[PDB]
């Protein structure tokens, strides 16, 4: 029982929160 496969630099490298303090731009409220 174990996840996070070796491929690619996984293990926290994981990124993705393009929008996020934008959203109040592209959609404010």
Do not use: C, E, I, P
């Not at 996070?4 to 934008?22: I, V």
């Amino acid at each position: 029982h174990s996840q996070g496969t070796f491929t690619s630099d996984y293990s926290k490298y994981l990124d993705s929160r393009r929008a996020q303090d934008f959203v109040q731009w592209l959609m404010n409220t």
